[PDB]
């Protein structure tokens, strides 16, 4: 043998990291937004978050069963011991992973960088985010590489609280000239529900309750 708790935690983390990488590469064009797994004695239940759940499932769940076969064979799960579920993200514009994939798709379609980046920002700010900051870099215009950033609204950079209020994701775009990096940051609106927003007040914001 029984592995120690340290070894068990390391093993579980490595399993999640490999599962995340496999789904990130497999579901790149379906707006993959995250993955969580719940382990019981009966089965291991894996829930995939995506924007286009129809493409993640496929006809009669052909795609989702193919992904189940991949995970089951790689990790040697037995029959009936592994299950996959697909749920949609409530707000796509508040997911950095979904938006950075959308930006990469738009760039791969020969769209201008200014157009695609501003399109992402307008969509994100319409979704209720406090702020969005997307940046595109590398061989944008010609042989010399330059980096250009587009931002709107609020954004916190320092401290440890931005790990909770800021959603980030970076992707590589493979163009004819070379590799283009796209990074999208979303300032999540603090919402009392934990699905979209840390639900905590901002670390430096002080509110005085109005008297009765």
């Amino acid at each position: 043998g029984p592995l120690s708790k340290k070894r068990m935690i390391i093993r579980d983390g490595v399993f999640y990291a490999e599962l995340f990488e496999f789904l990130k590469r497999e579901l790149a064009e379906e707006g993959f937004s995250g993955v969580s797994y719940h382990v019981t004695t009966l089965r291991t239940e894996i829930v995939i978050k995506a924007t286009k759940t129809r493409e993640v499932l496929g006809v009669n769940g052909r795609r989702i069963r193919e992904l189940t076969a991949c995970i089951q064979q790689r990790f040697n799960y037995k029959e009936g011991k592994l299950q996959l579920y697909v749920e949609r993200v409530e707000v796509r514009g508040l997911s950095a992973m979904a938006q950075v994939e959308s930006l990469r798709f738009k760039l791969l379609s020969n769209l201008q960088v200014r157009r695609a980046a501003m399109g992402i920002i307008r969509y994100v700010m319409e979704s209720g985010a406090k702020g969005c900051e997307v940046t595109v870099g590398g061989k944008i215009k010609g042989q010399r590489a330059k980096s250009m950033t587009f931002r709107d609204g609020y954004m916190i950079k320092s401290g440890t609280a931005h790990k909770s209020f800021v959603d980030s994701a970076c992707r590589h775009c493979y163009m004819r000239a070379g590799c283009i990096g796209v990074k999208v940051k979303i300032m999540l609106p603090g919402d009392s529900t934990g699905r979209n927003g840390p639900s905590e007040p901002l670390p430096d914001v002080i509110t005085v309750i109005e008297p009765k």
């Binding site: 340290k6 070894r7 935690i9 390391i10 579980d12 983390g13 490595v14 999640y16 990291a17 490999e18 995340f20 990488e21």
Partner: protein, 56 residues
């Protein structure tokens, strides 16, 4: 006998040549603590998913 010679030393399974990153299969600067077997550069990218955090 070229099948017996082929990768005969790699079958011994000792030293840095027998070990590689579980992500990138590189045989240099391998983190073997807690049986991670992950390259140092690959660990910095995947540390958040594995569960490690930067605190102090």
């Amino acid at each position: 006998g070229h099948l017996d010679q082929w990768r005969s030393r790699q079958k011994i399974g000792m030293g840095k040549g027998a070990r590689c990153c579980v992500i990138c299969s590189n045989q240099k600067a391998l983190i073997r603590k807690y049986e991670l077997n992950v390259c140092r550069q690959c660990f910095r990218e995947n540390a958040e998913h594995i569960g490690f955090t930067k605190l102090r």
